[PDB]
């Protein structure tokens, strides 16, 4: 301190920071709105300060590719640290440098296409649970809260695809597992006071409610020593050139996968159903495609899901509008130059995906939900370093193909059986949480009718 002269020195523009707070008061309307304003106010690069922490936003695609792919191992290896994390330091998305590289290797084969194909039957079964739970509300002409019913399904897939546990968490009961996973303003104080992280790490306050972590640490070792197709097994089989996965490390990845696949899968489904309800022609076109590929509500398979091109377009265009990461970030670990621009050590480089996905300079009518932008005709004109809903380079979303498959199997089975209509209580137009997550302000409620 005061680092608040850094961008002024390098001649990079940006909004003037306030002492101690940097630019964070500018987050009051949300990260996303701030990034769009900076994009329009300042052009291709700009800097700002989370507290004392310099953040350099970059929007040039070549420069993005340099940061995410070309210089990843050498410079831009880690994300911005947050805490306190406790033992979750060993989790893949949080770990750093060689320890992350290791964990990436031990977990990468778990997410192959081949392994994903063997997970489809198990992921198929809970699609049926999803329909029946939906019908009980469709037969009772009462509006439905999608996040609840989609969460129940996403919850259902996680416990099965990661541990073998099998529940209908929606109704079926207070089964011992649904509840510790229920615990599925503090994080802002971190940024003005990031020097308090090591404080909280010697105090063992875990952002992961220390009890849940205590529940699964023992829960895993119950499962481990009971067996001795799912993620736990795929990881246990792995610990049988890198030191094998420890027993606590395995747990920490389990936790990351539960987090990853719960509110992401559920929220993206809710975003998709909102678009399909408020664009009835897309919904019908999708329903026809599904009936053409799977006549008589034939059960979807891995191969038939990959066959559905309009399904893919609907999914991709939704992710354009609602990229739930909002931003991609890498810590600069060395003095470097990329594409004719100096970057000093310790700067956080940030790619503002939300802003890039809704930038008129690449997207016509960016606010409109228009699946055709992803027609095999048009999909080729889309810069992969502008549309980046799963990141890019060695540190992109490891769960990407699982998550696309998991969501699509849900949609297919659901669209075979129901149509989705707006209720008077639907928020139209949907608004984003002014807060820190990409979620709707009010939850998505829609009318559900049986075909
Ligand atoms: C639609 C759902 C999802 C989306 C849009 C999504 C998106 C992302 C994005 C944008 C990143 C950052 C990548 C980067 O910085 O370049 C990421 C990281 C990650 N995601 Fe996902 N994700 C989703 C679901 C999942 C699921 C289901 C898993 C299951 C395990 C998962 C596991 C991970 C992991 C482990 C990382 C950290 C990768 C690493 O640091 O090596 N994600 N995800
Ligand atoms: C800005 C603040 C500090 C408020 O919260 C974050 O920093 N939020 C996370 C960073 S840990 C994240 C999820 C998580 C893990 C433990 C406890 C809560 C949450 C994780 O790794 N989840 C797997 C995942 C999540 C979403 C998409 N795909 C994969 C979000 C994150 C986004 C992209 C890459 C890595 C992390």
Instruction: Determine phi and psi for 332, rounding to 5 degrees.
Output: -85, 115
Q: Are strands 53-58 and 348-351 parallel, antiparallel or unpaired?
A: parallel
Q: Please tell me if the CB atom of residue 277 comes closer than 6 angstroms to any atom of ligand 2.
A: no
Please give the CATH architecture assigned to the domain spanning 1-451: Orthogonal Bundle (1.10)
Q: Nearest bound ligand to CA 328?
A: 1
Q: Kindly give the interhelix angle for 280-293 and 400-417, rounded to the nearest 10 degrees.
A: 100
Residue 278 CA, ligand 2 centroid: distance in Å: 29
Residue 224 CA, ligand 2 centroid: distance in Å: 26
**Residue 30: DSSP 8-state:** -
In this structure, how many other beta carbons lie within 10 angstroms of the beta carbon of residue 21? 15
Q: Where are the alpha helices (DSSP H) in 278-399?
A: 280-293, 302-306, 309-321, 353-357
Residue 93 CA, ligand 1 centroid: distance in Å: 8
Rounded distance between C-alpha atoms, residue 346 and residue 88, angstroms: 23
Q: Which of 181, 188, 259 to mutate to test the pocket of ligand 2 (most atoms within 8 A of CB)?
A: 259
Residue 451 CA, ligand 1 centroid: distance in Å: 35
- Residues pairing with 50 in the sheet: 22, 53
Residue 403 CA, ligand 1 centroid: distance in Å: 9
3-state class of 347 per DSSP?
Answer: coil
Q: Residue 392 corresponds to which tokens in the numbers above? A: 């890019």
Q: Whose CA is nearest to atom 5 of ligand 2?
A: 187
Residue extents of the structural domains in the chain: 1-451
**Residue 447: DSSP 8-state:** E
Q: Residue 380 corresponds to which tokens in the numbers above? A: 């080729």
Q: Please tell me if the CB atom of residue 87 comes closer than 6 angstroms to any atom of ligand 2.
A: no
Rounded distance between C-alpha atoms, residue 396 and residue 422, angstroms: 35
Closest by Cα among 273, 296, 308 to 451: 296
Residue-wise burial string across 49-80, b where 16 or more C-beta atoms lie within 10 A, e elsewhere = bbbbbbbbbbbeeebbbbbbbbbbeebbbbbb
Instruction: Determine phi and psi for 74, rounding to 5 degrees.
Output: -85, -30
Residue 397 labeled ligand binder: yes
The full DSSP string for 230-295 is -HHHHHHTTT---PPPPHHHHHHHHHHHHHHHHHHHHHHHHHHHHHHHS-HHHHHHHHHHHHHHSG
Rounded distance between C-alpha atoms, residue 395 and residue 97, angstroms: 11
Q: Nearest bound ligand to CA 95?
A: 1
Residue 396 CA, ligand 1 centroid: distance in Å: 6
Inter-residue contact 268 to 274 (CB < 8 Å): no
For tokens 């802002």, the residue is 188
Rounded distance between C-alpha atoms, residue 266 and residue 283, angstroms: 19
Instruction: Determine phi and psi for 116, rounding to 5 degrees.
Output: -60, -35
Q: Whose CA is nearest to atom 25 of ligand 2?
A: 260
Rounded distance between C-alpha atoms, residue 310 and residue 317, angstroms: 10
Q: Please tell me if the CB atom of residue 85 comes closer than 6 angstroms to any atom of ligand 2.
A: no
Instruction: Determine phi and psi for 91, rounding to 5 degrees.
Output: -80, 150
Resolution (A): 2.2
Instruction: Find the length of the chain.
Output: 451
Q: Whose CA is nearest to atom 40 of ligand 1?
A: 93
Inter-residue contact 235 to 250 (CB < 8 Å): yes
Q: Are strands 445-450 and 418-422 parallel, antiparallel or unpaired?
A: antiparallel
Q: Whose CA is nearest to atom 28 of ligand 2?
A: 260
Residue 114 CA, ligand 2 centroid: distance in Å: 26
Q: Which of 154, 399, 411, 437 to mutate to test the pocket of ligand 1 (most atoms within 8 A of CB)?
A: 399
Q: Please tell me if the CB atom of residue 325 comes closer than 6 angstroms to any atom of ligand 2.
A: yes
Q: Kindly give the interhelix angle for 247-277 and 210-227, rounded to the nearest 10 degrees.
A: 110
């Amino acid at each position: 301190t005061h680092s608040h002269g850094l961008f002024k020195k390098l001649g990079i523009p940006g909004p003037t920071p306030l002492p101690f707070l940097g630019n964070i008061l500018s987050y009051h309307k949300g990260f996303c709105m701030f990034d769009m304003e900076c994009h329009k106010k300042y052009g291709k690069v700009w800097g700002f300060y989370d507290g004392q922490q310099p953040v350099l936003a970059i929007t040039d695609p070549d420069m993005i590719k340099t940061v995410l792919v070309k210089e990843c191992y050498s410079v831009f290896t880690n994300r911005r640290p947050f805490g306190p994390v406790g033992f979750m330091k060993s989790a893949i998305s949080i770990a750093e440098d060689e320890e992350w590289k290791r964990l990436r290797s031990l977990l990468s084969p778990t997410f192959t296409s081949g392994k994903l194909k063997e997970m489809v039957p198990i992921i198929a079964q809970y699609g049926d649970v999803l329909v029946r739970n939906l019908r009980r509300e469709a037969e009772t002409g009462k509006p439905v809260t999608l996040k609840d019913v989609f969460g129940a399904y996403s919850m259902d897939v996680i416990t099965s695809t990661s541990f073998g546990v099998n529940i209908d968490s929606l109704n079926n009961p207070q089964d011992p597992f649904v509840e510790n996973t229920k615990k599925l303003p503090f994080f802002l104080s971190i940024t003005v006071f990031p020097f308090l992280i090591p404080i909280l790490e010697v105090l063992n306050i875990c952002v992961f409610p220390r009890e849940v972590t205590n529940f699964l640490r023992k829960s895993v070792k119950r499962m481990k020593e009971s067996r001795l197709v799912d993620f736990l097994q795929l990881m246990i089989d792995s610990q049988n050139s890198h030191k094998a996965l420890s027993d606590l490390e395995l747990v920490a990845q389990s936790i990351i996968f539960i987090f990853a696949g719960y509110e992401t899968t559920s929220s993206v489904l809710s975003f998709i159903m909102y678009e399909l309800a408020t664009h009835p022609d897309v919904q019908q076109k999708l329903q026809e495609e599904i009936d053409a590929v799977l006549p008589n509500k034939a059960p979807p398979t891995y191969d038939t899901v990959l066959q559905m091109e309009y399904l893919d377009m609907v999914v991709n265009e939704t992710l354009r509008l609602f990229p739930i990461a909002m931003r991609l970030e890498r810590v600069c670990k060395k003095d470097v130059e990329i594409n004719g621009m100096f970057i000093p050590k310790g700067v956080v480089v940030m790619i503002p995906s939300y802003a890039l996905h809704r930038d008129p300079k690449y997207w016509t009518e960016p606010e409109k939900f228009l699946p055709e932008r992803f027609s095999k005709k048009n999909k080729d004109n889309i810069d992969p370093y502008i549309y980046t809903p799963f990141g890019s380079g060695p540190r992109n979303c490891i769960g990407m193909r699982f998550a696309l498959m998991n969501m699509k199997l849900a949609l297919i089975r659901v669209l075979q059986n129901f149509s989705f209509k707006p209720c008077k209580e639907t928020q139209i137009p949907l608004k984003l949480s002014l807060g820190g997550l990409l979620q709707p302000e009010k939850p998505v409620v829609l009318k559900v009718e049986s075909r």
